[PDB]
Design a protein around this ligand. Structure first.
Ligand SMILES: *[C@@H]1O[C@H](CO)[C@@H](O[C@@H]2O[C@H](CO)[C@@H](O[C@@H]3O[C@H](CO[C@H]4O[C@H](CO)[C@@H](O)[C@H](O)[C@@H]4O)[C@@H](O)[C@H](O[C@H]4O[C@H](CO)[C@@H](O)[C@H](O)[C@@H]4O[C@H]4O[C@H](CO)[C@@H](O)[C@H](O)[C@@H]4O[C@H]4O[C@H](CO)[C@@H](O)[C@H](O)[C@@H]4O)[C@@H]3O)[C@H](O)[C@H]2NC(C)=O)[C@H](O)[C@H]1NC(C)=O
Ligand SMILES: *[C@@H]1O[C@H](CO)[C@@H](O[C@@H]2O[C@H](CO)[C@@H](O[C@@H]3O[C@H](CO)[C@@H](O)[C@H](O)[C@@H]3O)[C@H](O)[C@H]2NC(C)=O)[C@H](O)[C@H]1NC(C)=O
Ligand SMILES: *[C@@H]1O[C@H](CO)[C@@H](O[C@@H]2O[C@H](CO)[C@@H](O[C@@H]3O[C@H](CO)[C@@H](O)[C@H](O)[C@@H]3O)[C@H](O)[C@H]2NC(C)=O)[C@H](O)[C@H]1NC(C)=O
Ligand SMILES: *[C@@H]1O[C@H](CO)[C@@H](O[C@@H]2O[C@H](CO)[C@@H](O[C@@H]3O[C@H](CO)[C@@H](O)[C@H](O)[C@@H]3O)[C@H](O)[C@H]2NC(C)=O)[C@H](O)[C@H]1NC(C)=O
Ligand SMILES: *[C@@H]1O[C@H](CO)[C@@H](O[C@@H]2O[C@H](CO)[C@@H](O)[C@H](O)[C@H]2NC(C)=O)[C@H](O)[C@H]1NC(C)=O
Ligand SMILES: *[C@@H]1O[C@H](CO)[C@@H](O[C@@H]2O[C@H](CO)[C@@H](O)[C@H](O)[C@H]2NC(C)=O)[C@H](O)[C@H]1NC(C)=O
Ligand SMILES: *[C@@H]1O[C@H](CO)[C@@H](O[C@@H]2O[C@H](CO)[C@@H](O)[C@H](O)[C@H]2NC(C)=O)[C@H](O)[C@H]1NC(C)=O
Ligand SMILES: *[C@@H]1O[C@H](CO)[C@@H](O[C@@H]2O[C@H](CO)[C@@H](O)[C@H](O)[C@H]2NC(C)=O)[C@H](O)[C@H]1NC(C)=O
Ligand SMILES: *[C@@H]1O[C@H](CO)[C@@H](O)[C@H](O)[C@H]1NC(C)=O
Ligand SMILES: *[C@@H]1O[C@H](CO)[C@@H](O)[C@H](O)[C@H]1NC(C)=O
Ligand SMILES: *[C@@H]1O[C@H](CO)[C@@H](O)[C@H](O)[C@H]1NC(C)=O
Ligand SMILES: *[C@@H]1O[C@H](CO)[C@@H](O)[C@H](O)[C@H]1NC(C)=O
Ligand SMILES: *[C@@H]1O[C@H](CO)[C@@H](O)[C@H](O)[C@H]1NC(C)=O
Ligand SMILES: *[C@@H]1O[C@H](CO)[C@@H](O)[C@H](O)[C@H]1NC(C)=O
Ligand SMILES: *[C@@H]1O[C@H](CO)[C@@H](O)[C@H](O)[C@H]1NC(C)=O
Ligand SMILES: *[C@@H]1O[C@H](CO)[C@@H](O)[C@H](O)[C@H]1NC(C)=O
Ligand SMILES: *[C@@H]1O[C@H](CO)[C@@H](O)[C@H](O)[C@H]1NC(C)=O
Ligand SMILES: *[C@@H]1O[C@H](CO)[C@@H](O)[C@H](O)[C@H]1NC(C)=O
Ligand SMILES: *[C@@H]1O[C@H](CO)[C@@H](O)[C@H](O)[C@H]1NC(C)=O
Ligand SMILES: *[C@@H]1O[C@H](CO)[C@@H](O)[C@H](O)[C@H]1NC(C)=O
Lengths: 221, 48, 134, 31, 127, 176, 113
């Protein structure tokens, strides 16, 4: 884990993984449910169903691998604090949709994934399932580059798929003066400089001054 | 072919939060995203 | 495109009325989107604006000249979908903008009968007040 | 009242393919 | 950055070594110095990098040759060494210290060192 | 040490101060060091507190150098200090929230007494100065009582509450 | 190197020591910029190779023991350093430039001996 300052809740805590957590995700090729509605509001019900099923996706994460990875993470995180102190995770507190939900793009299509079912945990010291994350495609996106909003093209009808690692993790500690117990950690991010710092962590640019001046016992002429 | 030279006895500070390298990477990625992804509607607030 | 249309007839104004973004609605109105866009299932942006409960975009669309008595393939008015989801403020908005309380769908369902089948009494009372003053 | 007027730009928006590629940074000469 | 740009970092090795060893190995390290878009658009950028390396090398060589040491890696100059710059023995700097810490010592003074070398070479050319 | 006052229901704008004009990361913490908001790039991140759903900020001013704090539906338990963390600054503000009202809502007659009710926050001692259209400039402390309430005393009395040389006005419902 | 030519002779003698410290379109202009830079470097190395004969190689200000006729300068030479610039002075001795270069090279020839 890397931070500006432990025991300050403003700074993010970047976590690097020794092993990759495989996440794979898909958009379905067509509608599968196709619900039949007889009651009133049927036209709006059908329009909402088609405009909701045109943008729906799921991401599968291996439960045992990610649980064992966060089992390494909690043991590493107990080093900087007390061992007997209970520490636990929680979902996102609130804010914009890029902070409350995972936001990533595949093929120019934006996915907002609900990571509330992922970060459910609790831990007590000295003591082939595949989880599914529902992700929706949102057209209106708050730009990370600049203050403002943008709407892009509607999604492509074809099947789109992304299989990828999980290399790093971004956390914010809830700083709290409540008995120094039950330290809760919530996912954060959004500042992409923190994302580039997680990979350019060991690099420094320098210039070369090859001209040197020294005293000695020599003589000239 | 990359050239990588290993030093023997050296101790240098590698503070990475004040790295100036990022405040360039970020502008390069903004240039890439502005050249590549053109949105249909782009709204930005401008204050006098 | 401002007036872009897909195979389902759904416009970007329909999306901006569904997701409740007022700024995109105003911007698309200023650039010249159709305020009465028609799709294959008969849904205008006013139905999606009224059903989800966002008063701003309803006001903005009704201030541009959207049809207050738009009929879909099911014959439902936006007032019917306003009273179906229990949005009272939207209901007096379309009664201030002139919605007919006597309109019929393809099943014979009035907004009064929508309100009393859903157990919504305060909607029924204010629309009965509006029908008494009609 | 502070004048804060939002500016909107409508642009032609075609479909593109998104695939990030590994890039290196190379220091200039003398660095 | 091939060639001259590689040998700008060519002498960067053994930077933490002994002060007396690097000055002897300067001579050895200097002796050790030795489809459409690829050649129209991509090639001119590496050409720019190479000519920038050549321009930097000639600028550094000209600045070195101001003081009468053109083409000399090691040269002795008739400037006397003021005791206020170092006030330390000759033995301990060459037997204990390294180049990085020594330039950290004389970064305050090297600006007037370069000027006094220029003035001494000017006085040498005057007589 | 700036202090602002509330009206128990309105909005209060608490601003920071910046000069670099680059939309620098900032936050908002109370005296218990609980996060309230915070800028992460160009988004808004609501802090995990009891001030979650009602806190807001003006996003259009972030590029100018102003980072405001907008709090809607203001209540008396939110009267606490707040900290700006723009760059390395530790500039603090104080919020003072109270409510002034009466006990009799509508049932009042001619020739009775009038009583007031002020819910002051803990850790303060404000001063209520009343002002009447008839000229009854009542001066007193926190609690005030009027012994005359007849037909000529109709209208909304403006009893302003002053503390630390800062005062805010209120209204009084009188139904005779 | 042609800049700051408005100064006089004695000022330029000090400031020379100060001096010591759409794709096809872009390619065809960048290639001419590369011709400018490479021929500038080549001219610098050619002039240094020429100056290596005279013994002043690598040195901006040099001194020789080559005799100077009073007929070439045809002036008392005291006032040419303060009020007269380089551009007029080069046009004063334009006819007598090759013979003094020939005088330098044989002077360095007996300097070898
Ligand atoms: C982290 O890194 C990993 C890996 O580095 C990232 O994972 C990658 O994610 C990519 C995004 O989906 C994905 O890219 C896709 O690969 C598809 C398969 O490629 C293979 O087949 C093609 C064709 O045979 C070969 O040329 C290629 O070399 C491969 O062998 C491509 O087919 C995809 O291209 C399509 O989608 C893009 C999306 O914008 C379109 O722009 C593009 O034009 C293509 O569109 C076709 O397909 C869509 C959907 O089917 C149709 O709607 C459309 O009309 C086109 O249809 C034609 O082709 C289909 C068959 O596909 C056919 O049925 C139809 O009739 C038409 O002929 C796209 O390029 C990478 O494969 C994937 N990598 C791996 C290893 O899995 C990961 O995302 C990264 N993480 C993050 C966060 O970014
Ligand atoms: C990194 O985080 C630590 C927190 O662990 C920061 O230390 C904190 O600094 C503030 C301001 O200097 C301290 O506040 C002061 O508290 C004393 C009473 O202890 C009070 O009298 C002062 O008026 C002031 O409010 C705070 O106590 C302190 N916390 C700890 C645990 O030491 C530190 O500033 C951060 N930054 C750096 C660069 O270290
Ligand atoms: C993190 O997890 C919690 C709980 O798992 C989520 O809290 C849920 O938030 C929604 C709204 O954000 C709540 O719905 C609300 O219900 C009340 C009921 O009266 C209604 O009045 C509101 O209008 C709203 O519909 C929901 O009840 C609440 N869940 C629980 C168990 O309290 C939270 O949203 C999650 N955060 C993220 C970013 O995923
Ligand atoms: C991410 O997933 C979690 C659960 O996997 C979501 O939390 C759930 O959110 C819904 C709606 O926000 C809650 O439903 C609420 O139920 C109450 C009582 O029936 C009702 O009054 C509300 O109107 C609303 O329908 C639900 O309780 C809550 N928790 C669970 C365990 O399902 C969370 O909202 C998801 N995140 C996002 C951004 O949607
Ligand atoms: C908390 O847990 C850490 C685990 O890292 C303990 O650190 C160990 O301390 C002992 C005694 O100094 C060493 O021999 C071990 O090498 C340490 N590491 C491990 C992995 O066991 C630490 O002692 C525990 N207690 C406190 C109070 O910090
Ligand atoms: C987060 O974890 C809690 C428990 O730590 C879950 O609450 C239980 O969920 C199961 C299955 O949904 C229920 O059978 C239990 O009745 C719940 N309560 C208790 C006290 O066990 C909660 O559902 C989890 N949330 C997510 C999104 O995974
Ligand atoms: C996710 O991580 C795995 C590591 O377990 C990656 O697999 C390696 O990929 C590199 C890159 O070419 C290969 O050189 C290795 O041989 C692979 N190892 C194994 C065991 O397969 C995988 O490529 C990563 N996923 C992505 C999209 O990069
Ligand atoms: C070494 O340098 C110091 C300055 O760093 C010189 O000290 C000056 O000495 C003269 C008289 O000799 C004084 O008038 C000056 O005030 C001193 N200080 C400065 C800043 O010039 C010292 O003379 C030098 N010694 C040698 C041998 O060169
Ligand atoms: C929709 O998907 C289902 C998947 O079971 C398939 O059976 C059906 O034929 C599909 N309908 C289409 C492509 O029209
Ligand atoms: C994800 O896991 C669920 C578990 O039931 C499974 O049904 C689904 O097919 C999986 N999806 C993918 C893309 O692996
Ligand atoms: C997707 O991930 C799940 C869980 O790790 C795995 O069982 C499944 O085989 C994966 N599907 C792929 C890689 O196509
Ligand atoms: C995750 O791992 C911990 C210990 O490693 C275990 O107690 C817990 O039951 C696991 N959870 C799941 C869902 O497998
Ligand atoms: C624990 O925290 C509560 C809340 O601040 C406080 O009232 C209590 O005194 C604390 N107890 C201890 C032992 O610190
Ligand atoms: C580095 O320091 C060790 C310390 O004993 C020494 O043995 C070694 O020779 C040093 N390395 C070099 C290159 O001098
Ligand atoms: C410097 O060297 C001399 C002679 O070797 C010695 O007497 C003196 O103590 C040394 N001084 C220091 C500071 O090492
Ligand atoms: C060499 O330098 C180190 C660090 O400055 C010092 O501890 C040591 O005593 C020095 N040795 C000699 C012989 O001066
Ligand atoms: C050199 O200059 C730096 C500038 O900050 C100063 O801190 C340092 O003390 C100076 N050293 C000497 C020896 O004058
Ligand atoms: C002037 O030039 C002549 C050649 O015309 C030469 O013989 C003579 O030595 C030169 N110098 C003087 C002082 O006459
Ligand atoms: C040259 O100038 C000096 C100084 O004014 C003067 O003494 C001398 O006579 C002049 N010589 C000639 C030939 O004019
Ligand atoms: C140089 O020679 C030309 C040849 O005619 C002559 O016109 C010119 O005046 C000469 N320049 C002088 C003497 O300065």
């Amino acid at each position: 884990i890397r931070s500006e300052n432990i025991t300050n809740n403003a700074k993010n805590i970047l976590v690097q993984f020794n092993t990759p957590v495989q996440i794979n995700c898909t958009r379905p090729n067509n509608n599968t449910r196709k619900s039949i509605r007889i009651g009133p509001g049927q036209a709006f019900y059908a329009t909402g169903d088609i405009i909701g099923d045109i943008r729906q996706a799921h991401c599968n994460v291996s439960k045992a691998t990610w649980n064992e990875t966060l089992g390494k993470v909690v043991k590493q995180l107990r080093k900087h604090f007390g061992n007997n102190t209970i520490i636990r995770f929680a979902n996102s507190s609130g804010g914009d949709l890029e902070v409350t939900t995972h936001s990533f793009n595949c093929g120019g299509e934006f996915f907002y994934c609900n990571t509330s079912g992922l970060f459910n945990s609790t831990w007590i010291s000295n003591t082939n399932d595949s989880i599914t994350l529902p992700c929706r495609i949102k057209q209106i996106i708050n730009m990370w580059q600049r203050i403002g909003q943008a709407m892009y093209a509607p999604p492509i009808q074809g099947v789109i798929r992304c299989v990828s690692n999980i290399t790093g993790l971004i956390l914010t500690r809830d700083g709290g003066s409540t008995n120094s117990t039950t330290e809760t950690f919530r996912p954060g991010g959004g500042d992409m400089r923190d994302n580039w710092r997680s990979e350019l962590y060991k690099y420094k640019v320098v210039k070369i001054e090859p001209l040197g001046v020294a005293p000695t016992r020599c003589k000239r002429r | 072919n990359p050239q990588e030279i290993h030093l023997e006895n050296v101790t240098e500070e590698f503070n990475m939060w004040k790295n100036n390298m990022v405040e360039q990477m970020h502008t390069d990625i903004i240039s890439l995203w502005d050249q590549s992804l053109k949105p249909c509607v782009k709204l930005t607030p401008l204050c006098v | 495109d401002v007036n872009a249309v897909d195979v389902h007839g759904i416009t970007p104004l329909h999306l901006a009325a569904y997701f409740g973004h007022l700024e995109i609605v105003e911007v698309l109105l200023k650039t010249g989107a159709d305020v009465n866009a028609r799709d294959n299932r008969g849904i205008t942006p006013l139905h999606l604006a009224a059903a989800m409960g966002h008063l701003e975009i309803v006001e903005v669309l009704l201030k541009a000249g959207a049809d207050v008595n738009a009929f879909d393939e099911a014959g439902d008015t936006p007032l019917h979908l306003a009273a179906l989801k229990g949005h009272l403020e939207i209901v007096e908005v379309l009664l201030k903008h002139g919605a007919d309380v006597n309109a019929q769908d393809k099943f014979g369902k009035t907004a009064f009968d929508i309100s009393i089948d859903n157990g919504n009494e305060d909607i029924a009372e204010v629309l009965q007040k509006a029908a008494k003053l009609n | 009242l502070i004048n804060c007027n939002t500016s909107a730009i409508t642009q032609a928006c075609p479909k593109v393919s998104f695939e990030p590629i590994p890039i290196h940074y190379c220091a200039p000469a003398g660095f | 950055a091939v060639g001259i740009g590689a040998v700008f970092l060519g002498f960067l090795g053994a930077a933490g070594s002994t002060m007396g060893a690097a000055s002897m190995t300067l001579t050895v390290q200097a002796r050790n110095l030795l489809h459409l878009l690829k050649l129209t658009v991509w090639g001119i950028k590496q050409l720019q990098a190479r000519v920038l390396a050549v321009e930097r090398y000639l600028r550094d060589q000209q600045l070195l040759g101001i003081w009468g040491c053109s083409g000399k890696l090691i040269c002795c100059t008739n400037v006397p060494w003021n005791s206020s710059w170092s006030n330390r023995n000759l033995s301990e700097i060459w037997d204990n210290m390294t180049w990085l810490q020594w330039d950290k010592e004389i970064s305050n003074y090297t600006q007037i060192i370069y000027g006094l070398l220029e003035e001494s070479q000017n006085q040498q050319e005057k007589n | 040490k700036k202090v602002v006052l509330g009206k128990k229901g309105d909005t209060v704008e608490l601003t920071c101060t910046a000069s670099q004009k680059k939309s620098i990361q900032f936050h908002w913490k109370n005296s218990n060091q609980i996060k309230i908001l915070g800028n992460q790039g160009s988004f808004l991140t609501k802090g995990p507190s009891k001030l979650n759903d009602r806190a807001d900020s003006r996003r259009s001013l972030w590029d100018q150098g102003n980072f405001p704090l907008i709090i809607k539906n203001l209540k008396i338990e939110d009267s606490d200090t707040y900290i700006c963390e723009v760059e390395d600054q530790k500039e603090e503000v104080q919020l003072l929230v109270f409510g002034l009202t009466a006990n009799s809502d509508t049932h009042l007659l001619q020739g009775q007494s009038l009583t007031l009710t002020l819910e002051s926050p803990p850790g303060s001692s404000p001063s209520v100065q009343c002002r009447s259209p008839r000229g009854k400039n009542i001066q007193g402390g926190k609690t005030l009582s009027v012994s005359q309430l007849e037909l000529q005393d109709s209208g909304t009395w403006t009893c302003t509450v002053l503390q630390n040389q800062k005062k805010v006005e209120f209204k009084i419902d009188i139904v005779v």
